[model samples]
Target: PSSSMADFRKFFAKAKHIVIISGAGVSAESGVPTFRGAGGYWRKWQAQDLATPLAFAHNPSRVWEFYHYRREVMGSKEPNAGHRAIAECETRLGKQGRRVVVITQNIDELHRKAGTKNLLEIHGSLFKTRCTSCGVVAENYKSPICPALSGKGAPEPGTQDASIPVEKLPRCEEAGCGGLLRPHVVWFGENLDPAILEEVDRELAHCDLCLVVGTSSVVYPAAMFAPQVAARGVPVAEFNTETTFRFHFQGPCGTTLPEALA
Candidate 1:
């Protein structure tokens, strides 16, 4: 093993409570697009323009169409080695009476697909949708964006000439309420789920080690985690193509995560 790998294994072996904070970088290894940079723009609209409550309110069909395209792309991607390694690490640690928790800022379900049991999707998920009116969230894997499934209704007010017709967008499936269904992801200007944050805080309080993978550590609250762990004197390790955090061991997660744990 390399010196860095040897050091990571030494730290991990002594850790009883480990936490992993993952971002789009981990999913990017699986061919998932990082939807925040310059490449994220589509049809003269930036991700910021489409991923906000105000955008949805202005034109639900347009917003749904954008998300439909994203879902289609994400649906085709598979979990990569990093995701598998994280899940396997959790399982191995469990067998040794240690706890491993994964807190992801990504909406992709790759970690879940990779069989991560002790995982918290703090940013919500791409496979889930929430009703705009009733707030009922449910798992929805339907690829085609269609409104017929939720019953015929007039287009949302002020919407026009959408790529997908307003009436054809999916709606809430909840009984006695046929409201517009929005992607169940934390959008710009929206607060993270309070319950999930509470759980993350609880985990951080006990974490002995933290591994920040594939993230730039810039997005707030999620980015704040690395510093929180370090402030507590818990060792923090980072795996990324770039160095953005002051972690003890800095390397590319796609290769380093599996290698050190192996």
Candidate 2:
């Protein structure tokens, strides 16, 4: 008998609507450094200093530079085994008349790249941009650019490079408006996407099991989503290096989700 296989089978047996909530740890397993860790550059600055709407409002150019660096770094990385495992689990569960949803707090887009069809990127993504004026969202596959003037206040004739100073914010590619284009990621002091929230709620309402992975689950509001589901009697399985302090404070946790879906 396949004991490991049996474990997965047992888990899937009662899991009809399964939600996999992922975070930085899943991507970290793939050699991608987390933006929030002590060793990462992001730790040098307070999240509020660079990742708040107020920060963007005060100095959009700096905010753009921060995201530009993140985009460049993530662009070179590939999805890891953890991402593939979630996709596989979703495929298996879907075949068995179960619904599997992946809700991730990461902006790296690794889960999407791994072929996870049903996904909700709660923190948004690095490969996308939005026009601040018209709210038009667009995919950014080409190199990043800052159409705005440079240090000398001279407009760049060609596409601007990532090395451009943080003082220059990018303008929209749209010729007519030429509005400032910002990364589509949700920042601190920002609200979650309402549509994504509604979708998560609809799934959670009927979910049988919710797997919390990687995230410290201390980032409030999002941290509350899991406990809310658990209160409805759904089993909450956590996959993490150490027990989440906040989640552990919530009644009882069922299991520590395994590294593989096997």
Candidate 3:
């Protein structure tokens, strides 16, 4: 390990409560699409075009198809070394009466699949659904989500809309409520879940150490977290190809995390 990461390792050895802010870059290491402009496409629309409440209201089937495609992509992906290292550290630390709280912007559920127990998905999850009619939130992992979206969501430019009826889209299975459901993720023009933000605030306020991993540190709120932690004089180690903090480790987190957490 470099001298910088060596110091982080020493600090980690004694840190009781750690807070991690993860982003799309972490998931990208696992072959998940970063979902930025140009490259992130479903037919002719960027995520910005389809990942809004207005967009969903205009065409719910298109949105569901996009999510179904995301689920399929994540299904084929595996959590990498960085994800494993964090999960392992959390488990090992908690066993000793310490804590590790992960605040992630990723909606792909890689951290959950990586076995991270203490996690807050600030962007919500692709596997979760919320009913528009009943407002009941539930976890649903059905591939394709519905039969109508069987082979849709092609990323190519020439792909046409499947035009699946709204009634045939995903529906909440809450007893008698068969209302149309939407992906539980926070949309482009939506606000972050306040309850989750409260928990994240508390975690950041108390953490003795902070890790800003895999994120480019541009998105607001998440972008504000590491700087806040650094302001509190907590040691903030930024493990990414770049940084937004104190100790900048310029590489993929998959390579850096295993070494630092070793």
Candidate 4:
């Protein structure tokens, strides 16, 4: 919270290609629950237990139901001031022929909803699905994707699996390719998309300034980006509740970003 804002302001003013890397804490200001807490249970299953390939492979119904609840929750939430501030920065810099790119680890569409144009979602999204067999990805926003899940996904204890038949779950709509579909999210033990990674590498390689928002410098790959950027002698500022980088702006991203971007 005691970082030199004057230094960051000067660095930001001169920056041509700026990258703002965000995390779950940015969305926390929007009332999105951190499912990693003590109550992070759905159907008596921890997110770590259910958000895996083996879990989805063993029980597709349970996985889809969990994600159904997630989409429902995430859809109801709105973007916070941090998201808007960054979006405004990007748009404002665009007209100045400068660039402000946002690379987020969140799957929620709040950044998009906030009107951020140069954005990258390294973890995939909640509003999209991918077919297991056909490998086709598509956007879906239906409340209850299928009739079987109309009243399911209550996030209650002692709730047994809906046990939806394999043929009854969300599936590919492509003709002659009616395969089972899964949420288009990087599951636990899954790798980030290589193409998105490559682009992140490109941005990290060229950016003159970096702003790490709402993450305490954990959660690797993203954790590694800003330090490497700083290694290249670029000015990097970290906006988080706890300290991590040289210029630690200790606070919520909403407060720090609005104060700085404005």
Q: Can you give the TM-score per candidate against the true fold?
A: 0.88, 0.78, 0.94, 0.95
Number of backbone clashes in candidate 4:
1
Tens digit per residue, CA lDDT, model 1, 132-228: 8899989988756564323222233343335555555787778898887899999899998899999999998999888878875556545778777
The residue-level lDDT of candidate 4 at 161 comes to 84
Instruction: Rank all candidate structures by their lDDT, best first, as comma-separated numbers.
Output: 4, 3, 1, 2
10 residues in a row with least lDDT, candidate 4: 215-224
For model 1, state the Cα shift of residue 71 in Å.
1.4
Residue pairs with colliding backbones in model 1 are 147-168
Residue 108 accuracy (lDDT) in model 4: 83
Give the Å shift of residue 192 in candidate 2.
1.1
Regions more than 4 Å wrong, model 1? 1-3, 145-165, 217-221, 243-251
State the lDDT of candidate 2 residue by residue for 105-146, as single tens digits: 878888888889999888788788888888888888555444
Off by over 4 Å in 4: none
Flag the better candidate by TM-score, 1 or 2: 1
**Which residue window of length 10 is worst by lDDT in model 3?**
215-224
In candidate 2 the C-alpha lDDT for residue 173 amounts to: 71
Model 1: per-residue Cα lDDT at residue 201: 92
- Per-residue error for 60 in candidate 1, Å, reads 1.0
As for lDDT, the candidate ahead, 1 or 3, is 3
